Design a protein around this ligand. Sequence first.
Ligand SMILES: CSc1cccc(Sc2ccc3n[nH]c(=O)n3n2)c1
Ligand SMILES: *[C@@H]1O[C@H](CO)[C@@H](O)[C@H](O)[C@H]1NC(C)=O
Length: 344
Amino acid sequence: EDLRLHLLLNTSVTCNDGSPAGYYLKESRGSRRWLLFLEGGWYCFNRENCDSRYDTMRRLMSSRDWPRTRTGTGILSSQPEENPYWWNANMVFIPYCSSDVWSGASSKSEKNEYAFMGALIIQEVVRELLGRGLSGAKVLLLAGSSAGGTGVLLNVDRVAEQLEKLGYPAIQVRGLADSGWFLDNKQYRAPTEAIRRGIRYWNGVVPERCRRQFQEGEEWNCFFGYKVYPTLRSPVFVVQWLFDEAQLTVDNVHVQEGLRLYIQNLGRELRHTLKDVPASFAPACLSHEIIIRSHWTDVQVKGTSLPRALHCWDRSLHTPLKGCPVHLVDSCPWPHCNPSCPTG
Ligand SMILES: CSc1cccc(Sc2ccc3n[nH]c(=O)n3n2)c1
Ligand SMILES: *[C@@H]1O[C@H](CO)[C@@H](O)[C@H](O)[C@H]1NC(C)=O
């Protein structure tokens, strides 16, 4: 139970119910690398569905019941055997308690039953960590899974701008977006409408260059990785299963020719969106999330594991590297055509 809870000293930066947000921290005194991980867990987009979430998913809307510690797993593990990539880094787990895909900038008030402060939570965590050693960092990797992976895409450049404006231009900010790269595709039998409604409910904010492209009322576009990624300046590594279970869920998929063609076309479209993403890991598996699973080391694409690919990415950010690839996208067209896919 190696990561210790700190509730935010600025108690106006809150979870949905107005309780303070926070972060779990395990410092590594001999390290200038910082990993800030954004938890996922869907979202809620109106009073009624947020009230439902508060009844049965309250840890995602409140800190009142959070434990004092959490165990770092996968990329958050400090054990080299579990985390070949960054086992010696300073580790931060930021709980998702804003239900806004990390985009919100709205306080609880006379007119708002809930606070949606995901974007401000990240910025407040960063600011408070600067007093705890982040000021000496050489690399800040903002990582996240599921809604947290989309959160990376929405927030990585804002973290880079925050540190520049605070006078730390030497800290290299990078993103690792796991399982947050979705397609606004046709369903097999309204995802984009729920986000459009959510953005208004949350006062959601998107990266500036993406906002300027799509403009007022169209900011929902920036929640889709293939549209927001080209607008970003920070290096971002994209991890995405080609047949992501959450993508299939929103597509109303739960095998005859129509569905076979649908699934194959989904994998093809996902692969196509990653063709010009130089740092990516996209196995042909039906699964969801990878980076904080203890067995995250097991999956390989073209014989290369994700921890290896991430290490190769670090080297590339010091022309391609002999035997140390960073772009790893499966080409086989059906779930589990890659033998290293997770079993479940
Ligand atoms: C509904 S269109 C969309 C597009 C981009 C991000 C999101 S948010 C989301 C989507 C799927 C998922 N699975 N697990 C988890 O946390 N999430 N979060 C939604
Ligand atoms: C606390 O956070 C809010 C919202 O981000 C900010 O407006 C305010 O200035 C902060 N207070 C302090 C003392 O930093």
